[PDB]
Symmetry: C2
Subunit: 155 residues, 2 copies
């Protein structure tokens, strides 16, 4: 079973490099929908935590990352997070629901990855990968279907 712990649209400053041997960047604030869900791994009952970001203005924009205890222990040490893996979603959801929080998404040069941060790299940083294949096919199919609903209601 996969339980959603967060599903709100946040304001994020979206940074992306554009050149080699020149510091040109594509910077702009945007509405990024963040989805934090709790799941258990199908192979071992081990608790997981999936992070997923999507843009409503960019259908192709899909980046996710799923944490396990092992994966989180590397993260915690790096950003000097004192909390354990179970009490960490409680901490971040609270940190996120705060209007004063700065969500900066630093995108990959080839938009293959994205560093989702809080305030700056040093404060907090998850590296989400590019979602493709069947997981993007479904996400794209949800949009088409939800927009098919919107155009039907349109009278």
């Amino acid at each position: 079973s996969k339980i959603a712990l967060f599903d709100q649209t946040l304001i994020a400053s979206l940074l992306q490099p554009l050149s080699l041997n020149q510091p040109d960047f594509k910077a702009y604030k945007t509405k990024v929908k963040l989805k934090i869900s709790e799941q258990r791994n199908e192979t071992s009952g081990e608790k997981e935590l999936k992070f997923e970001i999507s843009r409503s203005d960019d259908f192709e924009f899909l980046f996710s990352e799923t944490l396990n205890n092992e994966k989180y222990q590397i993260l915690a040490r790096d950003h000097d997070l004192t909390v354990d893996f179970d009490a960490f979603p409680k901490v971040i959801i609270q940190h996120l629901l705060c209007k004063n929080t700065e969500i900066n998404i630093i995108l990959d040069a080839e938009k293959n990855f994205c560093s989702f941060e809080l305030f700056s790299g040093k404060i907090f940083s998850i590296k989400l990968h590019a979602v493709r294949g069947d997981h993007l096919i479904s996400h794209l199919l949800k949009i088409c279907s939800s927009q098919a609903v919107k155009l039907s209601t349109f009278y």
Copy 2:
């Protein structure tokens, strides 16, 4: 990639209903056929892509791309005397004819479908289920075109 055909045809869609019995749920529908002339990315060899899509079904996507080698098997089966280069000229003409019967026989698992003229006899290509990046783009076109429609309204 040069498009040689891009019209919406009326096709009788035969959907299977049984296993070990040829019972079908038949209904006419609007199937957009696109025949394009391309060249293989590995070797400059000329290729001919057949692609069917439904406007009423976003997931409905089937393609099949012919090369000379692949066409030589097809030509023998349907006793087509024509060469690979002179064959698109022949089918486009066959298709533009109002009298032609376009029947698409669907796969029980919706993985393939035999696109045929009248029955299999004249012309019958077996198209596979289009997935991956080719469906991603096709789905991205719909989202984008529907994003335009919802902006205007």
